[PDB]
Amino acid sequence: SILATPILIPENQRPPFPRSVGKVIRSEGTEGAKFRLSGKGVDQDPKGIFRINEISGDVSVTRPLDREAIANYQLEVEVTDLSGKIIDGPVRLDISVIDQNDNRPMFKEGPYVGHVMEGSPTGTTVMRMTAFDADDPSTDNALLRYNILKQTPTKPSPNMFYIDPEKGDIVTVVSPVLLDRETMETPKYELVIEAKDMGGHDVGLTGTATATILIDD
């Protein structure tokens, strides 16, 4: 009878506030009855972000929210007497904050340096390079896809390596007969690694980091 629904709310809502977000329905209900709300977000830190209209059962939010700060609130609603005795025992009101894409992919282990053998077979792992993302990992908003943007130098061949778009594993793609040194200038290679958002998708957010790769004897 007290009855009402799990509210979803996008983070980073623009002003003004407060804004309606849901509505607790009762029915079987006296006159001079009052919806009262409580729990985390009302009267437990963070106090004061959610409000119910005591007549209409309109649940409203009073300010913008941050999913990577707080991802869920569990509130409790109830109706009351003219006095304050509960004429409709308390039920749970769940609020899920919806991920918005407001974090940029960023590498956090740098500087990045891996070594590899001069004359290695294809698919030999140089190193691993995973990026971090403060957004929801179960949404496109985290979900990373990796690419190599630049190789220096561009000899013997322009792209000697290739990264796992999924795992971020750098591996060798070039034979022993060129992937060597003998008459080499700098022992090493310089790779510009990009991690992008929304799993590839033309329109992601990016983070970079240049890996330094040393050819070994």
- Rule CB under 8 A: choose which of 23, 34, 36, 188 binds its own copies: 23
Q: Does 190 bind Ca ion (CB under 5 A)?
A: no
Q: Does 120 bind its own copies (CB under 8 A)?
A: no
Which partner, its own copies, Ca ion, none, binds residue 3 by CB below 5 to 8 Å per kind?
its own copies
Please tell me whether residue 211 adopts helix, strand or coil conformation. strand
CB atoms within 10 A of CB 36: 16
Q: Does 67 bind its own copies (CB under 8 A)?
A: no
Q: Does 144 bind Ca ion (CB under 5 A)?
A: no
Q: Which is nearer to its own copies, 140 or 164 (CB)?
A: 140
Q: Does 67 bind Ca ion (CB under 5 A)?
A: yes
Only one of the segments 34-42, 78-86, 97-105, 122-130 lies at the binding site for its own copies (rule: CB under 8 A); that segment is 97-105
| Beta-ladder partners of 88 | 79
d(CA 206, CA 76): 40
Rg of the chain over CA atoms, in angstroms? 28
Site map 25..44 versus its own copies, x via CB under 8 A: x-------------------
DSSP string, 60-127: EE-S---TTT--EEEEEEEEE-SSS-EEEEEEEEEEEEEP------B--S-SEEEEEETTPPTT-EEE
d(CA 65, CA 63): 7
Q: Which is nearer to its own copies, 14 or 85 (CB)?
A: 14
Task: Write out the residues near its own copies by the rule CB under 8 A.
Answer: 3-5, 8, 10, 12-14, 22-23, 25, 98-104, 138-141, 143, 198, 201-203, 205
